[PDB]
Amino acid sequence: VCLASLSDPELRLLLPCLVRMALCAPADQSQSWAQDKKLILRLLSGVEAVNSIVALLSVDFHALEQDASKEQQLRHKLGGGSGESILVSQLQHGLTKVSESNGEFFFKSSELFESPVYLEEAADVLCILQAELPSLLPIVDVAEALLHVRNGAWFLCLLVANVPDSFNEVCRGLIKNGERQDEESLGGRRRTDALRFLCKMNPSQALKVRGMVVEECHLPGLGVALTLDHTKNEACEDGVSDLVCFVSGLLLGTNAKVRTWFGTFIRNGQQRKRETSSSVLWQMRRQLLLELMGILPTVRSTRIVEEADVDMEPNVSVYSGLKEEHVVKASALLRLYCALMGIAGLKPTEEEAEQLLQLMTSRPPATPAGVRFVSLSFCMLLAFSTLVSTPEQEQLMVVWLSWMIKEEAYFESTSGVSASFGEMLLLVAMYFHSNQLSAIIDLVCSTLGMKIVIKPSSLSRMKTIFTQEIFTEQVVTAHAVRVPVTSNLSANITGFLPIHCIYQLLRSRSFTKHKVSIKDWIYRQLCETSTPLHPQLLPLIDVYINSILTPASKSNPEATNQPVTEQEIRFSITAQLLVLYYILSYEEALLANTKTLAAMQRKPKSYSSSLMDQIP
Amino acid sequence: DANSALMELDKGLRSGKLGEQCEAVVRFPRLFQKYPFPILINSAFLKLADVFRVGNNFLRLCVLKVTQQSEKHLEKILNVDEFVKRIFSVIHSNDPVARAITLRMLGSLASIIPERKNAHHSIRQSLDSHDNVEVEAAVFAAANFSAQSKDFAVGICNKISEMIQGLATPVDLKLKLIPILQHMHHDAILASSARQLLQQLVTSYPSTKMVIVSLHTFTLLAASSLVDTPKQIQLLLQYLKNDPRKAVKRLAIQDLKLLANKTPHTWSRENIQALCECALQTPYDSLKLGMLSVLSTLSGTIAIKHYFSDLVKLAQECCYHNNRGIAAHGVRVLTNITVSCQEKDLLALEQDAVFGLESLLVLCSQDDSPGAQATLKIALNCMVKLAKGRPHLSQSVVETLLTQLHSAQDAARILMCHCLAAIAMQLPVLGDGMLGDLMELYKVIGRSATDKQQELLVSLATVIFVASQKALSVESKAVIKQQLESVSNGWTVYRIARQASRMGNHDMAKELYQSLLTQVASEHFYFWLNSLKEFSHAEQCLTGLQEENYSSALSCIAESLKFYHKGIASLTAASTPLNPLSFQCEFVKLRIDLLQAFSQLICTCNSLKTSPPPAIATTIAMTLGNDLQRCGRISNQMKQSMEEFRSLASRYGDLYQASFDADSATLRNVELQQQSCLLISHAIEALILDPESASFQEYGSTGTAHADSEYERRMMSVYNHVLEEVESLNRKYTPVSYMHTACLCNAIIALLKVPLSFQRYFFQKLQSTSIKLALSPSPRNPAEPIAVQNNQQLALKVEGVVQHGSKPGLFRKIQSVCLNVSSTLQSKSGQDYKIPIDNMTNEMEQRVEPHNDYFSTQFLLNFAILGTHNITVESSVKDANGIVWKTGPRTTIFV
Numbered sequence A: 001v002c003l004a005s006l007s008d009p010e011l012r013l014l015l016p017c018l019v020r021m022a023l024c025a026p027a028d029q030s031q032s033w034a035q036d037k038k039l040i041l042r043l044l045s046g047v048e049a050v051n052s053i054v055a056l057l058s059v060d061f062h063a064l065e066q067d068a069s070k071e072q073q074l075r076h077k078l079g080g081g082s083g084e085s086i087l088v089s090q091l092q093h094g095l096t097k098v099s100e101s102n103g104e105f106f107f108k109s110s111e112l113f114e115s116p117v118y119l120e121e122a123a124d125v126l127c128i129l130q131a132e133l134p135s136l137l138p139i140v141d142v143a144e145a146l147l148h149v150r151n152g153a154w155f156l157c158l159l160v161a162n163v164p165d166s167f168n169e170v171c172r173g174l175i176k177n178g179e180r181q182d183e184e185s186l187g188g189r190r191r192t193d194a195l196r197f198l199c200k201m202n203p204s205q206a207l208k209v210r211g212m213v214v215e216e217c218h219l220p221g222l223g224v225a226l227t228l229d230h231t232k233n234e235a236c237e238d239g240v241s242d243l244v245c246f247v248s249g250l251l252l253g254t255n256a257k258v259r260t261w262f263g264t265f266i267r268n269g270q271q272r273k274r275e276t277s278s279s280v281l282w283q284m285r286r287q288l289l290l291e292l293m294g295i296l297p298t299v300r301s302t303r304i305v306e307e308a309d310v311d312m313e314p315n316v317s318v319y320s321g322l323k324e325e326h327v328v329k330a331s332a333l334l335r336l337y338c339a340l341m342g343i344a345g346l347k348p349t350e351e352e353a354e355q356l357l358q359l360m361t362s363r364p365p366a367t368p369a370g371v372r373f374v375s376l377s378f379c380m381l382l383a384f385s386t387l388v389s390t391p392e393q394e395q396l397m398v399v400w401l402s403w404m405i406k407e408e409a410y411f412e413s414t415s416g417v418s419a420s421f422g423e424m425l426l427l428v429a430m431y432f433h434s435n436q437l438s439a440i441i442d443l444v445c446s447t448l449g450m451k452i453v454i455k456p457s458s459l460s461r462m463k464t465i466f467t468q469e470i471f472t473e474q475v476v477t478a479h480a481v482r483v484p485v486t487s488n489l490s491a492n493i494t495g496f497l498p499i500h501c502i503y504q505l506l507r508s509r510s511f512t513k514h515k516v517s518i519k520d521w522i523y524r525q526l527c528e529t530s531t532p533l534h535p536q537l538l539p540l541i542d543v544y545i546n547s548i549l550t551p552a553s554k555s556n557p558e559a560t561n562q563p564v565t566e567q568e569i570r571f572s573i574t575a576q577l578l579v580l581y582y583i584l585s586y587e588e589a590l591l592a593n594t595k596t597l598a599a600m601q602r603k604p605k606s607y608s609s610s611l612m613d614q615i616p
Numbered sequence B: 001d002a003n004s005a006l007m008e009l010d011k012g013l014r015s016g017k018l019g020e021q022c023e024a025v026v027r028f029p030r031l032f033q034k035y036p037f038p039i040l041i042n043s044a045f046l047k048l049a050d051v052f053r054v055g056n057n058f059l060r061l062c063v064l065k066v067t068q069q070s071e072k073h074l075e076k077i078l079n080v081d082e083f084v085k086r087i088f089s090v091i092h093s094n095d096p097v098a099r100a101i102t103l104r105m106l107g108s109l110a111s112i113i114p115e116r117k118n119a120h121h122s123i124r125q126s127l128d129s130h131d132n133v134e135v136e137a138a139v140f141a142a143a144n145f146s147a148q149s150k151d152f153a154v155g156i157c158n159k160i161s162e163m164i165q166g167l168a169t170p171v172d173l174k175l176k177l178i179p180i181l182q183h184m185h186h187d188a189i190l191a192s193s194a195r196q197l198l199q200q201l202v203t204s205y206p207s208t209k210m211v212i213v214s215l216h217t218f219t220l221l222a223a224s225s226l227v228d229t230p231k232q233i234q235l236l237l238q239y240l241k242n243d244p245r246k247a248v249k250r251l252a253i254q255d256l257k258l259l260a261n262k263t264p265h266t267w268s269r270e271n272i273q274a275l276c277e278c279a280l281q282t283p284y285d286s287l288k289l290g291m292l293s294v295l296s297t298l299s300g301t302i303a304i305k306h307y308f309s310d311l312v313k314l315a316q317e318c319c320y321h322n323n324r325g326i327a328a329h330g331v332r333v334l335t336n337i338t339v340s341c342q343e344k345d346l347l348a349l350e351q352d353a354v355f356g357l358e359s360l361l362v363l364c365s366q367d368d369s370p371g372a373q374a375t376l377k378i379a380l381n382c383m384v385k386l387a388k389g390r391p392h393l394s395q396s397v398v399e400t401l402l403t404q405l406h407s408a409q410d411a412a413r414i415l416m417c418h419c420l421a422a423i424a425m426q427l428p429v430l431g432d433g434m435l436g437d438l439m440e441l442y443k444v445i446g447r448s449a450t451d452k453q454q455e456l457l458v459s460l461a462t463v464i465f466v467a468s469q470k471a472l473s474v475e476s477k478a479v480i481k482q483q484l485e486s487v488s489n490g491w492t493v494y495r496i497a498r499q500a501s502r503m504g505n506h507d508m509a510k511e512l513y514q515s516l517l518t519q520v521a522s523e524h525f526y527f528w529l530n531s532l533k534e535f536s537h538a539e540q541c542l543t544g545l546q547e548e549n550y551s552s553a554l555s556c557i558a559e560s561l562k563f564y565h566k567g568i569a570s571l572t573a574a575s576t577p578l579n580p581l582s583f584q585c586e587f588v589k590l591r592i593d594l595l596q597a598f599s600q601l602i603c604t605c606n607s608l609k610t611s612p613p614p615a616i617a618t619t620i621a622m623t624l625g626n627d628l629q630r631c632g633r634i635s636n637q638m639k640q641s642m643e644e645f646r647s648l649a650s651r652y653g654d655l656y657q658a659s660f661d662a663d664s665a666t667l668r669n670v671e672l673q674q675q676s677c678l679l680i681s682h683a684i685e686a687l688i689l690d691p692e693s694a695s696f697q698e699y700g701s702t703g704t705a706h707a708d709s710e711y712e713r714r715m716m717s718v719y720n721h722v723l724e725e726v727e728s729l730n731r732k733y734t735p736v737s738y739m740h741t742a743c744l745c746n747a748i749i750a751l752l753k754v755p756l757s758f759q760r761y762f763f764q765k766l767q768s769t770s771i772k773l774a775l776s777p778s779p780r781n782p783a784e785p786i787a788v789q790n791n792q793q794l795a796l797k798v799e800g801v802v803q804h805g806s807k808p809g810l811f812r813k814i815q816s817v818c819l820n821v822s823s824t825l826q827s828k829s830g831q832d833y834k835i836p837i838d839n840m841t842n843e844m845e846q847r848v849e850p851h852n853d854y855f856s857t858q859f860l861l862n863f864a865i866l867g868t869h870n871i872t873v874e875s876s877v878k879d880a881n882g883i884v885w886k887t888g889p890r891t892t893i894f895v
Helices: A007-013 A030-038 A045-057 A063-075 A079-094 A098-106 A111-130 A145-158 A163-173 A175-182 A189-197 A210-224 A228-238 A241-254 A263-268 A276-290 A296-310 A313-318 A327-340 A350-359 A368-383 A391-414 A421-433 A438-446 A461-467 A476-481 A498-508 A519-525 A537-546 A561-566 A573-592 B002-014 B018-034 B038-053 B059-069 B081-088 B096-108 B117-126 B133-147 B150-165 B171-183 B188-204 B208-224 B229-242 B247-262 B269-280 B286-299 B303-307 B311-320 B324-340 B346-359 B370-389 B395-404 B413-423 B428-444 B453-467 B474-484 B490-503 B507-517 B524-542 B551-572 B583-607 B634-659 B664-686 B710-726 B740-751
Strands: B769-771 B802-804 B816-825 B846-848 B869-874 B891-893
Touching (some): A007 A210, A007 B551, A007 B583, A030 A045, A030 A063, A030 A145, A063 A111, A079 A111, A098 A111, A111 A145, A163 A189, A163 A210, A175 A210, A189 A228, A210 A228, A228 A241, A228 B551, A241 A263, A263 A296, A263 A327, A263 B551, A296 A327, A296 A350, A313 A350, A327 A350, A327 A368, A350 A391, A368 A391, A368 A421, A391 A421, A421 A438, A421 A461, A421 A476, A421 A498, A498 A519, A498 A537, A561 A573, B002 B018, B002 B038, B018 B038, B018 B059, B059 B096, B081 B096, B096 B133, B117 B133, B117 B150, B133 B150, B150 B171, B150 B188, B188 B208, B208 B247, B229 B247, B229 B269, B247 B286, B269 B286, B269 B303, B269 B311, B286 B303, B286 B311, B286 B324, B311 B324, B311 B346, B324 B346, B324 B370, B346 B370, B346 B395, B370 B395, B370 B413, B395 B413, B413 B453, B428 B453, B428 B474, B453 B474, B453 B490, B490 B524, B507 B524, B524 B551, B551 B583, B583 B634, B583 B664, B583 B740, B634 B664, B664 B710, B710 B740
Antiparallel strands (some): B769 B802, B816 B869, B869 B891
C-alpha cells in the first residue's frame, strides 16, 4: 500500500544516490534515515561520506519534525525503559475522555506521553498474543496514523523489543503500517515473513481473521519484490497455500517472464503427484473453498489460467490445429487439469468446457508429443462425459472421433510411436462390445499416474449408447486387423500395443465370417523381435489355438510353408521358440476335443510327419 | 500374494500330470527370486523334497537343476534334517540313474550338510560301483563334499589315490578323478600327500591331457594353500624351459598369469629373471605374448618394486615388435616401471616410453578392428597413468595426441578425446594449450560423418568444455553453428548440454536446454528440461558479479533465487511415484537455502551501518563492556546466521549419508559444499563475534596435490585464502566488525565465483540398492493396532533383504545393517509431542553382519501405557570402511 518498494529496495543495499530519486517517498522511512544520520558512528571514510550525503539530502520541510522525534527518542533512553519495565512488572503482578486526554496532541508534544502510549500498546499486544482472538481497538490512532507509526518506529529503533511481536501487533491492529516496519530495520524481512507464515493454521485464510494476515503478507511481498518466491515456497511448505497462490499470481501478473511455461501451472503441478502431506493439504483447502464463491485468489487463478488457455484458441480456430511449439504446453495444461479434477475435483462451467472441448479436438502436427496429447484428451473425454447436454458439442466431438479413427493410420505411419491413440480406441471399443466397464477404468488409470475413480460403472455407460450408433463391429474390427506389427519390442514402453486389442478380439468372438485368417498378422508380429518375452504372447497363442476348434470361426492352420521357410538354418531364437510352442499347442489341441459338432468342421489340416522330422 | 502362488503350485503338483509337475518345478526358481522370505523358501523346498521322494525319475532331474540354479537361497532353510532325510531316502534304490541323481543332489547340498556321515558313507560306497553315470555323480559329490568337510577329505584322499594309481581305470576316469585333489588344503599333511601324489602322477603319466589336468590341480592346490607357491613357480618355470610341447607352455603361461593376478607378492627376483630368460629364447609369438602379459600383470604390483637388468632389456626389445599386442604389453611394462620405480638411469627410459607410445599409435589409428582397439585402449590408459603419476611429461604426450588426432578416419578420435579429457582433469594448462587445436578439429569435423558422428561430436564437445574455462568467445557460436544445421539428434545435444553443465559452462547449457524445450515427446521430460534450463540460467546470472560490489549483488542474488524457485517448482512438478527424484529435489532445496542464508548475511552486513551502535546503547554502555563487547542488536542476527549455517551443515551431512549411491565426484562436491558452509559459520562465529571464544589457529597443511578436478582446486584455494585472511585479523580491531565484515563479504563473493558443478549422480542414477525390511509382526491387515495385554511383552521379529538393481560390487559393498527401533506415543498426552520423555528409551541398536543377502534380528519393548503407540525401524546400512549411511525406508507400524 504505497510502501515505497523501489526506495526500500534501494535503501536495503546502499543509500548513496537514491536519496535524490525519491522526493515525496522519503516521508515514512525518514525516522531510520534521521537515526542513521544523527547517531552515526563514523567508522570508515566512505561510510562517513555517505552519512554526510544522506544528512545533506534529508534537508526537507519535515526535517524539524524528524529532529524533534530524534531528540525525544534520545531523551527517552533511560526513563522510558524504566517506565516500560515498571508497567510490565505491574501487568505480571496483576495477572497472577476527550480523545484519550488528547492522545494525538500529547504524543507529539511530550516524550513521556508517547512512551506511555507505546508501553500500553505493547501490553495490549502481549495480552492479545498470550490467549486471545480479536482485531479490535484499532480506531484509536486512525486520524493520526502517520505520527503513530513514526513514534512506533522511533520506539522500536531506540528501545529493545521483539520483531516478531511487533509484526504480529501490526498485523492485528493495522496492516497499512505493518509494511512500514519493514522500512524501519530493512534487515528482518525474511524473519518477519517466516513468523507471519508460522502464525496461522491450515484451514484458514478463507473465511476467518487470517485474511488480514494474508493481505499483509501479500503487500509485504509486493513491496519487497525479492523474497516473494521464497515466501511462496515457505507457505506452500508450511501452511496457508492460498497466500502462496496469490503471491504467485501477483508475480506472474506483474513480471512478464516465464513465457515458455506458465508459472501458475508450474506451481500448481505439484499437488496430486507427490508430497502427500501438502497434497492432502491442498485437497482439503480446495474442498473447503469450492462451496465458497466470495474469495479472490482462487477465482483470479482460474481466470488467469483460463485466459492463458484461450490465448491458444485463435490458433486452432484459423488453422487446422495446434503447432509444434505449442503441442507440449497444451498437453501439460491438460494433464494439470486432469490432476486437479481427478478426485473430489471442482465443478466446471460451460464457458470453460467449450474451450476445453475445442482444444482437446485439435489437429496435432503428427508428433509423438501430439499423439500423447491426443491420448490424454481421449482419456479426459472418456473419464468425464459432461458434454452431452448440448448437441453441438457432442456432434463436434463425434466428428473429431471419426476423424481420429480415419487418420490413426497416418498418425502411426508418420510418428514412430509404439502405441498410438487408435490402439486405445479399438481397445475401449472392444471393451464396450464385451459388456464390461472395469477394463475402461483400468485403462484410464494405467495410461497416467492417477489412481482415481470416476463412477461405479455409471459414467461411461452413456458412451455405450453411442458405441451402438456408428462405431459397430464393422469398422473397429477392420481397424484392429489393419494395424502394422510392432518391430523390435521392448516390453518397457508405456502404452497398449496392438497385441492387447488383437487378444481381446480373438477372445470375445470372431463370428464375422469375412475377417478370419489373421495368421498373416501373427506371423508378421512374431517374425523377429527377440528382445523381450511379452506376457501377452502366450495367451495370444493360446486363444489363437482355441480359435481353430471353434464352430464356424475357421482360421487357417498356419500351413507348413512358414515353418519350412523359418526354421531352415532373421528368425531369431525367440521366434523359433514361439513357433515351436504354437506347433506343440496345436498338436495338443488336436487330441483334446476331437469333436467339432460333426458339421463341415472336418478339415484340421494336420501335419503328415514330414515337418516334425525337420524341426530340431 | 506369495501364499496364493504357493497354493496354486501345490494344487498343480497334487495330481500327477507329468507336464504340469515339470512346469511347476521349473517355475519354482521364479517364485524363489520373487519372494526371498525364509518361510516360503523352506515350505517350497519341503515340497520339492516330497516330490523328489516319489517320482517318475524325470522330476528328480528337474529338482536337481532347480537346486543347482538356486544356490544362494539354500542356507535359509529352517527344517534341514527332514529335507536331507527325504532326499537321502531314494539313494537305497537299485536304479543307478536314481542313485546318480541323488548323489548329484547331495553334492549340490554340500554347503548346508558337511557333517552328515550317511552322505559320506554313501559317496564312499558308490564311488567304486559298477556303473558309468553313477561313478561320475559320485565323483562330483565327492569333490563337492571335499571342498568343505576336512574329515571327508582325509577319508577320501587315500581312496582317490588307490583309484588313480590302480591302473585299472580308463584315461578319462583318471582325468576326472585328478581335479578332486584340488580340495586338499585343510591340513599340511594333506597338502604334502597331494603334492607327492601329483608329482608321481606327472613323472609316471606323461601325456598332454594328463599333465595339463594334473598341473591345473597342483596349481589350484598351491594357490588355495599359500605354503609352497615359490616351489610352484619354480616348477612352472622349469616346465616352460624344458618341456617342448606347446599346450603345456600355454597352460603354464595362463598359470603364471593367474598366480600374478591372485598372489603377486610371493614372486622373487630369480623367478622374474628366469621368466625373462625363457621369453628371450622363445621363437614363437603367442608364447612370448603370453609371457609378456604375465610380466605386465606382475609389474603392476609390488613385484616390480621388489625386483629393484633383464626385464628392462626385454621390455625395450619387445616395445618395437612387428605385432601390436606384444608392443602394447611392452609399453605397458615400461610405463609401469617408470611410474613405480624411481631409479637414476630410468629417467632416460622415459624417452623410450613416450616415443614407444607412438609405436602403438601409428599402427592402431585407422585399422578398425577389435584386436587393434584393445592395444589402443591399453596404450591410452597407460598414457593416462603416466600423466597422472608423473606430471613432468604431461605435455610430451598431449602434443603427440594432438598430432595424431589428424591421422584417424573418425574411428579412434573418440578414444583420443576420452584420453584428453581424462588427462586434462589434473592440469588445466594442457587444456589452455590444446583448446585451439580442439576447436580446429571441431570446425574441420563437421564436413561429413555417418557411422558414429553422434559419439564423435559428443566426445569433441566434452573435451572442448573440459579444455575451455569460460566458453564465452566465438567458439560457443561456432559449436552452435556446427550443431544446428547438422543432424539434430536429441540425445547427442542432450549429452553435450549435460557435459557442459558438469564442467561449469552454463551459457551453452542454457542455449541447448532452450533448444530442447521445444522438442519433447512427453510431459515429465519437458518439466525436467525446463528445470535444467532454469538452473542453468540462475547459474549464469550468478556469475554476473563484480569484485568489490554490493549494489547490484543483491539484485543478482534475488533473480538467481527467483530462477531457482521456478526451477525447483518445475522439477517437483515432475516428481512421480515411478522412478522418483529424491536427490535432485533435496540438492536444489539445500542450495536455495544456502543462497538465502548468504543473502541474509549480506543484508545484515549492509544494515550494520543503519544505526546499530546507538540502538542497544540506551540500555547498557556497549563501549568497554567486559561482558558483551560492542553489544548491539546485530548480535541476534549473527546468532541466527550461525545457527542457520549449522543447520545447513547438518543437512549437508545428512544428504551425504542419505544417497549411498553417489559416485566419488558427487560425494566430494557435497563435502566441499559442507566445508564451505562450515567455513562461513566459523568466520561468522570467531571473527564477527568475540575472538576469545575459540582463538584456534589453523596451523596445518591443506590443499594437497590430489584433487581430480579444477573445481576442487579452486574451492581449496578459496578456502586457503579465507583461512589466511581470517587468521590475521582475529586480534587486530575491535569486535564491532569494522574491517571484519569487509573480508567476510570478500570471502562470500569469492565463494560465489565458481557457479556450481552438477556432478555425475545428478543424472543417470545407477546402483539402485534397497533394503526391503519386511518384518513379521502379528497379522495386521487394516490400520487397527494389535490387541496386546499391555503388560506381558511385544515382539517384532524384523528381517530384511537387500536388492540390487545394478552391479552390486560397483562402488560400495554392504557389510552390516545397524537396525534401529524406537517407540513413541501417538495420542497427545499433555503436549503436542508424545510425552515428557516420549518413551524413546527403547533403542536397542543392533549390528548384524549378513553373510548372504538376508538378515534377521530380534527386537522387544516394554511399555505400560494404555494408549496407542508407534513403532518405527531403520536400516542404517554400514559399508566396509564404516559410515552410518542413513537410509530412508521409514517402515512404521502402530503396534
